[PDB]
């Protein structure tokens with residue numbers, strides 16, 4: 165079920181609003197191992213539940229139990245040590261929650277593969293940029309007939325957190341993530357740039373990237389880890405763009421990157437080895453937005469999953485003269501851009517240092533895809 169462009173959905177309320185996203189300060193001055201301990205006090209019980217769901221469903225489809233045995237006993241050794249800070253951060257999470265490290269690593273692997281998204285950057289007539297996104301998730305292990313949801317997708321909602329990463333008590337970047345995950349998929353560096361990651365599918369894909377890694381070719385970056393390293397350590401739109409366009413990746417991806425002034429917005433369509441396309445704002449020629457879902461801009465959607473066309477229609481209807489968090493939230497609340505897989509909606513304003521995220525629901529009748 166789809167619908168006409170929504171209006172009057174902001175500030176959030178009603179049946180598509182699950183609730184607010186809590187803020188946590190992550191202190192980069194702490195040793196990596198300790199950075200997540202305070203968050204785990206609050207969200208550790210929920211992380212234990214989501215890994216329980218994954219384990220139990222895998223052990224249902226593979227009743228020998230041998231896959232989860234490999235996850236728990238061998239997966240860390242197959243991949244080898246991660247570069248810092250990620251190894252120690254994940255070990256800290258595993259140790260405080262008493263979850264096997266291989267399951268934390270597996271959780272961190274989920275985000276290289278099973279997300280869907282709608283990401284939008286807009287530029288108004290004053291040159292002001294907004295960057296918004298829906299974060300969708302579907303691993304499709306468990307269906308709950310009693311409320312028409314996917315088990316793991318729903319369990320991500322209480323794991324969702326807004327994070328203020330600080331060094332010397334000063335914000336470096338802000339992000340929305342899931343407790344237990346140490347990469348980043350959504351965030352901004354105030355006054356500098358904003359970044360969202362959308363999954364991309366291809367036959368030279370993440371499954372092959374993992375195989376190459378296991379077989380000893382480790383020159384590549386994990387997509388959630390390069391995103392985190394850019395947010396944490398890059399200092400400008402152009403620097404971020406260069407890193408994201410050129411770094412070798414474990415999996416294909418779309419990077420949606422906004423800056424801090426007119427014209428600074430692009431979609432970088434990535435193969436593992438390089439950029440297939442960089443599509444940038446061109447306000448002088450009437451190109452005042454970019455919209456990216458999970459298919460290549462020059463190709464047709466997957467017939468049964470076209471969120472790009474409705475997002476673009478609602479944007480064109482809104483026009484460049486009525487761009488704000490409120491009107492962009494309206495778009496991200498319109499089915500199928502909002503769908504049963506939508507975990508959260510995030511809204512970013514780099515130059516005004518405004519960052520919001522909201523947990524979502526999509527009441528029946530709603531598309532599951």
Ligand SMILES: *[C@@H]1O[C@H](CO[C@@H]2O[C@@H](C)[C@@H](O)[C@@H](O)[C@@H]2O)[C@@H](O[C@@H]2O[C@H](CO)[C@@H](O[C@@H]3O[C@H](CO[C@H]4O[C@H](CO)[C@@H](O)[C@H](O)[C@@H]4O)[C@@H](O)[C@H](O[C@H]4O[C@H](CO)[C@@H](O)[C@H](O)[C@@H]4O)[C@@H]3O)[C@H](O)[C@H]2NC(C)=O)[C@H](O)[C@H]1NC(C)=O
Nearest residue numbers: 206207209210213308310311313315318319321322323525
């Ligand atoms: C659709 O159903 C999902 C599954 O729920 C089951 O099926 C439905 C149909 C009912 O029969 C229900 O009774 C079944 O259990 C449902 O998923 C549930 O979502 C909630 C809300 O996110 C989760 O709540 C979190 O619970 C953990 C503790 O969970 C344990 O204890 C509770 C209380 O006894 C049990 O109900 C659980 O089964 C577990 O045994 C908390 O740690 C966690 O707290 C943290 O997050 C909240 C924010 O939500 C903060 O306020 C806190 O401070 C903490 O930071 C949550 O309270 C629940 O775990 C989850 N269940 C499962 C099994 O995944 C889903 O939301 C439904 N979706 C829709 C659209 O209706």
Ligand SMILES: *[C@@H]1O[C@H](CO)[C@@H](O[C@@H]2O[C@H](CO)[C@@H](O[C@@H]3O[C@H](CO[C@H]4O[C@H](CO)[C@@H](O)[C@H](O[C@H]5O[C@H](CO)[C@@H](O)[C@H](O)[C@@H]5O)[C@@H]4O)[C@@H](O)[C@H](O)[C@@H]3O)[C@H](O)[C@H]2NC(C)=O)[C@H](O)[C@H]1NC(C)=O
Nearest residue numbers: 192193194195196247248249250252389392393394396397
């Ligand atoms: C962004 O860039 C920075 C700068 O390159 C990256 O920071 C480095 O990260 C690696 C991996 O985690 C660290 O390497 C470890 O260092 C351990 C020793 O750490 C102590 O001694 C260091 C001197 O050798 C010292 O620099 C370090 O202080 C740093 O960390 C403290 C704890 O967080 C913090 O309070 C300090 O202010 C300072 O930031 C420690 O006191 C060693 O045991 C390990 O084997 C490993 O080698 C580096 O220490 C980090 N360097 C700095 C200057 O922070 C960072 O990871 C990048 N971020 C991303 C996401 O990619």
Ligand SMILES: *[C@@H]1O[C@H](CO)[C@@H](O[C@@H]2O[C@H](CO)[C@@H](O)[C@H](O)[C@H]2NC(C)=O)[C@H](O)[C@H]1NC(C)=O
Nearest residue numbers: 354355356357399400401402423424425514515
């Ligand atoms: C947008 O970002 C750019 C790039 O970081 C900013 O320009 C830099 O500003 C710093 C000061 O923090 C200077 O040290 C650099 O020399 C500047 N670089 C360039 C290429 O000019 C710019 O100030 C930001 N603009 C806004 C409006 O925030």
Ligand SMILES: [Cl-]
Nearest residue numbers: 305306315316
């Ligand atoms: Cl699921």
Ligand SMILES: [Cl-]
Nearest residue numbers: 182321322523
């Ligand atoms: Cl919730």
